[PDB]
Design a protein around this nucleic acid. Sequence first.
RNA 1: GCGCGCGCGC
RNA 2: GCGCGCGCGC
Length: 95
Amino acid sequence: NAGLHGNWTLENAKARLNQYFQKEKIQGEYKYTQVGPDHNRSFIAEMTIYIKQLGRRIFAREHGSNKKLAAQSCALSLVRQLYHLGVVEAYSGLT
RNA sequence: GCGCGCGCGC
RNA sequence: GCGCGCGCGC
């Protein structure tokens, strides 16, 4: 499954996104939305970034049971999009 | 190796 | 805070 998407996963996606941000001298911000009531809260994270290489912006919107997971999934979608658009290489590290 | 910073885990 | 792994710069 990650095999279809350049071996980008929840555990390596944020690092690779931040490295893209650094190389491009941009900064993306996670925008969070509360889901469920206060005693059963989970999160939407979303982010929009302009990609110089493509001349267009991309977007991700993901749910997680906590803020950390919501942000990791958001970065995962973003990074997998960049992979399939050829902006970003397949993951080369270890698994 | 230093400066700035990031990831995963505990 | 600690461990391991990285990035940009010099």
